[PDB]
Amino acid sequence: LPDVVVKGLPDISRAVINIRDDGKRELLVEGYGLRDVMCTDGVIGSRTTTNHVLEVFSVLGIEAARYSIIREINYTMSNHGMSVDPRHIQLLGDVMTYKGEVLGITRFGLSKMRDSVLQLASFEKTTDHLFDAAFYMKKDAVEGVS
């Protein structure tokens, strides 16, 4: 009995009220809520920000998500040191997003576009890609560098 939610959502781990900019004030919230807390009355949701881009794709999606992922990459890497320059960052987020869904760089997500079986069996895989391409009788082409 002394457990169940009286009010609020089933998301937030905790929140904080902090001093924003020079003299102003605002809050930061830890949770997966997003739109619901944006839909939550009492706050202007026009200008906001959220982490874990993949979920941002589930609300704003595509472009806005691509603009967010290049925003966070630039930020955290502009602190510790040196410079990665603006050019190289934009191309990294573009080749991931351009298909219309955010995925990549991982063996589960590395197969999206590329139809070449040898280069995919090169980076990471052994048995499956060779037998799978034989089953479905794939053809494709020899094109790329590797």
């Binding site: 739109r35 026009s46 200008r47 920000t49 704003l60 999606g61 472009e63 603006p86 934009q90 219309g100």
Partner: protein, 215 residues
């Protein structure tokens, strides 16, 4: 409870704002006074004297104007109706389909209440000339394209399409794509093979544009 109820009538009123400004950029004809009203006029029109709002009387009709029927040669006015109870079933969707039958037009759109079930999913995409659209009241509060990061998405006709392919001299498709059922996609109601010009702003040279098709 008076408190939580006035929260919902402000919700639906702002939800009425969203579906209003949405029908404007599609090329259809309205005025700035149609999308802009205070709480006063809203309480008089769609809310009774008892203090409890209504549902079915919110239904209206709008048409296109000028260039909208020029640029896109095939188009016309539509018919929008609302829902009743969160539970979805055959019910009033029958006469809704019937309403589309004799009144023709293009796409009847209706805003949900709370829950969606496969019952109402019996037939979504019907009729030979056209189809319909589904929207939830929850998800709709403020417009996404106007929010922060989402830039202007400009839809173009078949004319500009083939010319764009005559610029870089390219075969069709093969361009950066855009998924459908995507909250931005379904917002503007894009069909198969429709190119939308996107103007984005990030700081290197500043403003620049790119093209993305719709799969």
């Amino acid at each position: 409870m008076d408190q939580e109820n006035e929260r919902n009538i402000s919700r639906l009123w702002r939800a009425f704002r969203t579906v209003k400004e949405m029908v404007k950029d599609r090329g259809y004809f309205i005025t700035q006074e149609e999308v802009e009203l205070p709480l006063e006029d809203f309480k008089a029109k769609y809310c009774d004297s008892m203090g409890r709002p209504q549902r079915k009387m919110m239904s209206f009709q709008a048409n296109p104007t000028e260039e909208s029927i020029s640029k896109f040669p095939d188009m016309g006015s539509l018919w929008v109706e609302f829902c009743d109870e969160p539970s979805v079933g055959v019910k009033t969707m029958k006469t809704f389909v019937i309403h589309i039958q004799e009144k023709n037009f293009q796409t009847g759109i209706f805003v949900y209440q709370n829950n969606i079930t496969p019952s109402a999913m019996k037939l979504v995409p019907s009729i030979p000339p056209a189809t319909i659209e589904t929207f939830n009241e929850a998800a709709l509060v403020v417009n996404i394209t106007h929010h922060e990061l989402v830039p202007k998405h400009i839809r173009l006709s078949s004319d500009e399409k083939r010319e764009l392919l005559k610029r870089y001299r390219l075969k069709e498709s093969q361009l950066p794509r855009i998924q459908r059922a995507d909250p931005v996609a379904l917002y503007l109601g894009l069909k198969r093979g429709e190119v939308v010009k996107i103007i984005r702003k990030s700081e290197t040279s500043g403003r620049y544009a790119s093209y993305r098709i719709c799969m």
